Amino acid sequence: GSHMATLKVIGVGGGGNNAVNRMIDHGMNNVEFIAINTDGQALNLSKAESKIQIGEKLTRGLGAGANPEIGKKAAEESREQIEDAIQGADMVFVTSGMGGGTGTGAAPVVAKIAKEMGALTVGVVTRPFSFEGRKRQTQAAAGVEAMKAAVDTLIVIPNDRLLDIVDKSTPMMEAFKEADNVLRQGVQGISDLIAVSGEVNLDFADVKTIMSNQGSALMGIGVSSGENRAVEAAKKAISSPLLETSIVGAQGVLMNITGGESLSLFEAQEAADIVQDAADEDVNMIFGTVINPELQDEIVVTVIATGF
Ligand SMILES: Nc1nc2c(ncn2[C@@H]2O[C@H](COP(=O)(O)OP(=O)(O)CP(=O)(O)O)[C@@H](O)[C@H]2O)c(=O)[nH]1
Numbered sequence: 001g002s003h004m005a006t007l008k009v010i011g012v013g014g015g016g017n018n019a020v021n022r023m024i025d026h027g028m029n030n031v032e033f034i035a036i037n038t039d040g041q042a043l044n045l046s047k048a049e050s051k052i053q054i055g056e057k058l059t060r061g062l063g064a065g066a067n068p069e070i071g072k073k074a075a076e077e078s079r080e081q082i083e084d085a086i087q088g089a090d091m092v093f094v095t096s097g098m099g100g101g102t103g104t105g106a107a108p109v110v111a112k113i114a115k116e117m118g119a120l121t122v123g124v125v126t127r128p129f130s131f132e133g134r135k136r137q138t139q140a141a142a143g144v145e146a147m148k149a150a151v152d153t154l155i156v157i158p159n160d161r162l163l164d165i166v167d168k169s170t171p172m173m174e175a176f177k178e179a180d181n182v183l184r185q186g187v188q189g190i191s192d193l194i195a196v197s198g199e200v201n202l203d204f205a206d207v208k209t210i211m212s213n214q215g216s217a218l219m220g221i222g223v224s225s226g227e228n229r230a231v232e233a234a235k236k237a238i239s240s241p242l243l244e245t246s247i248v249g250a251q252g253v254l255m256n257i258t259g260g261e262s263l264s265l266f267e268a269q270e271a272a273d274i275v276q277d278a279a280d281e282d283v284n285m286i287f288g289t290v291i292n293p294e295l296q297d298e299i300v301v302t303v304i305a306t307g308f
Pocket residue numbers: 012013014015016018019038063064065066067096097098099100101102103104126127128129132136159176179
């Protein structure tokens with residue numbers, strides 16, 4: 001028969017659960033959410049269907065107070081509850097802000113558990129703003145290294161990059177939604193790739209080949225119309241204003257192109273060439289195509305890049 005992949009998104013700590021709440025608000029389908037936190041006040045406000053309060057014996061229901069050893073121990077002591085919530089997942093996205101205690105310490109434990117439960121495990125984490133100081137940055141760096149050791153693939157968003165995309169008045173919440181989009185569009189892109197039957201079909205086994213045990217990653221989506229649409233969508237898919245890891249140096253790529261019946265062979269080559277040339281490597285590509293006749297002049301390019 002057919003395979004139906006279960007995708008889960010797990011928020012760990014404040015920032016991660018913020019991202020989960022905003023994704024649920026934005027509306028996601030076919031994805032399951034898990035909220036993990038020490039902070040009982042924030043966890044009570046989570047919109048996630050599955051909630052795990054960790055470390056209550058250690059924190060009395062408070063956060064970890066920037067102590068990553070308490071975050072790590074809190075997750076370890078709730079291993080069975082975390083395993084039970086994950087069980088059945090084919091793919092898990094662990095999202096977390098690094099630099100505090102709960103996210104820094106517990107997110108690598110959650111990711112380790114997910115991988116041991118058999119899930120393809122992707123971390124999407126932030127580094128703190130420079131204005132938060134050097135100690136926060138150093139602690140975050142230890143969290144990023146622990147994440148790298150625990151996940152299949154890791155996407156790092158330095159929060160300082162948000163300062164590159166705001167004007168002096170952009171609300172902080174609007175900026176945070178831009179960082180959220182990295183996770184949301186990557187999850188949505190995989191979900192859609194799985195759900196739809198393509199003319200050149202890609203599926204979850206291709207995602208596993210490109211992402212399993214591959215270190216840093218990029219996940220992007222680009223949409224364009226009109227003249228040069230394939231080139232423009234491909235460039236947008238690989239544009240990484242918020243990413244620590246750019247496309248440069250990628251050695252494996254999952255690339256899908258969705259368009260209407262006008263989708264031309266020539267423009268599919270144009271788009272593939274953009275990704276090959278930007279990588280500035282010989283990229284091992286798994287290429288797919290979907291014809292969606294509901295589309296008119298719109299083209300959508302999805303890119304997952306690993307192998308740096
Ligand atoms: N882009 C973004 N960054 C966030 C968000 N919330 C927190 N951050 C950033 O993540 C870092 C850690 O914050 P948070 O996730 O609340 O930490 P925690 O580990 O839960 C806090 P404690 O140590 O007390 O338990 C912050 O220093 C900040 O850089 C958010 O919603 N969006």
